[PDB]
């Protein structure tokens, strides 16, 4: 029975009526005008633009547990020192004695 | 003292939540006469 609770009660009913009202306002009109389109300064040939709009990529790779083990592999076995393993083709196994 | 309190709260909540959501996971079906 307070003046401020009445005020908050009107605003609560406003927030409740917003979705049924403006969602339907959106449904009937919508931005399906076939001209509503986002515009940007950079040339669209190379904006790293999305292709196929929403894209969901089917996935059949390693399990999530295996994935976090791979990410753990960054500290357990990084690819750094393998660069300095010996010349892997043949190490000059037939290294001529003169050279 | 507070560190021990929060550790004990963590442990108790962990095991209680396991109990709660485990018996809520269709425990009645886990019998040998199902199907």
């Amino acid at each position: 029975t307070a003046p401020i609770v009445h005020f908050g009660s009107v605003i609560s009913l406003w927030l409740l009526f917003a979705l049924p009202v403006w969602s339907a306002a959106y449904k009937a009109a919508g931005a399906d005008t076939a001209e509503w389109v986002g515009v940007s300064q950079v040339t669209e040939d190379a904006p790293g633009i999305g292709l196929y709009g929403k894209y969901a990529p089917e996935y059949d790779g390693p399990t999530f547990r295996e994935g976090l083990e791979y990410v753990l592999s960054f500290a357990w076995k990084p690819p750094i020192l393998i660069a300095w393993k010996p010349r892997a083709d043949l190490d000059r196994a037939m290294m001529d004695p003169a050279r | 003292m507070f560190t021990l309190k929060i550790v004990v709260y963590t442990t108790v909540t962990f095991f209680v939540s396991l109990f709660t959501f485990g018996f809520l996971s269709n425990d009645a079906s886990r019998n040998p006469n199902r199907k």
């Binding site: 931005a31 389109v37 986002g38 515009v39 790293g48 292709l51 709009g53 999530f64 | -």
Partner: protein, 177 residues
């Protein structure tokens, strides 16, 4: 066969034009080892949090509810002023919607079993994207703003912590060092 964002690096095999934010940038190559649907959903969700978070840093910092523990500009130090009671009932509000939008499916092995595309919780009240071109440009805009707002809340927050000054104030005062 070379990444556009990393010319020196070869393109991640998983990364592709179809994604809508792809510029070939996955130097680590997480894509190869996790559901890219899950990764995109995580990216868009973190960014949708941070996009609101930066504006919050900013609006809370200028205007605020006239309620007694709601007025403390430095957001970092504001989280604790408002009572956790409130912060918890909001955390619970976000829980409801987490499960509402995701429709119960909220694990990596279950989230996308219903065919929901990543990063969509079926929200589109305005700025309709039925136009694939419009969807295509809006998704790149959303991804770029997600990525930018990540850096943002990061800076704003770590910076508010560094100088106990909200965003707008700090720079104007810009007490350095």
């Amino acid at each position: 066969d070379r990444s556009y964002a990393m010319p020196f690096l070869s393109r991640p095999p998983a990364l592709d034009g179809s994604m809508a934010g792809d510029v070939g940038f996955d130097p680590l190559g997480f894509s190869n080892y996790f559901d890219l649907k899950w990764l995109r959903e995580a990216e868009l969700k973190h960014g949708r949090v941070c996009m609101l978070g930066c504006l919050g840093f900013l609006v809370q910092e200028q205007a605020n509810l006239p309620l007694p523990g709601f007025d403390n500009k430095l957001a970092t130090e504001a989280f604790f002023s408002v009572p956790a009671g409130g912060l918890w009932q909001i955390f619970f509000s976000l829980g409801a919607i987490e499960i509402i939008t995701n429709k119960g499916k909220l694990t990596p092995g279950s989230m996308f079993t219903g065919g929901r595309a990543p990063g969509d919780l079926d929200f589109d009240p305005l700025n309709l994207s039925v136009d694939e071109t419009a969807l295509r440009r809006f998704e790149l805009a959303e991804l770029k703003h997600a990525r930018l707002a990540m850096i943002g809340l990061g800076g704003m927050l770590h910076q508010m912590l560094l100088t106990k000054q909200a965003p707008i104030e700090q720079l104007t005062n810009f007490k350095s060092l």
